[PDB]
Design a protein around this ligand. Sequence first.
Ligand code: O3D
Length: 185
Amino acid sequence: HHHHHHMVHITLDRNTANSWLIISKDRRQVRMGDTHQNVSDNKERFSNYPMVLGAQRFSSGKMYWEVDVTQKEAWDLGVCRDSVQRKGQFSLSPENGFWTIWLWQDSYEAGTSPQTTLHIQVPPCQIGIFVDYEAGVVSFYNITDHGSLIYTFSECVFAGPLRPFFNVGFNYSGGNAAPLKLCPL
Ligand SMILES: O=S1(=O)CCN(Cc2ccco2)CC1
């Protein structure tokens, strides 16, 4: 692809994080902590899942960023509406305001309802995310495989400002502690 020139510098918003997440000082990395991270509760925090939002809000234009997923077993990545539900149980779907892909139990899937199987020959270590607000497009690229397309959501109905969306995943197995990292431009 040729989306690299729309690169944006994303930072994580501490205030939206699940209370067990540890966001690095530079606000570019996030990982699952061993316990509650000693923060007050607020209506922004994701309660049920290890999720956090980027600080940036997008309502126009073309945006691109890259995330490092090296050695993780589970994660969700994409964008979501600023107004998505934070508390309780919910599914990642466009109807709920999410445009995402994920890894879970050795399979990659796009967060459609119901979910769509992805065909990835080279397990990615870094994912590129492209958003064209006007066109209604969210695309995912495999940076490990020369930028090959993973998935395009088209005819998106954003219906609000978008925020970068992250889930570090659960670590029941002891094999999913590694962080998500925002890769340099
Ligand atoms: O992933 S875990 O090993 C450590 C965190 N716990 C509690 C927790 C935090 C957020 C959602 O649920 C689940 C099992």
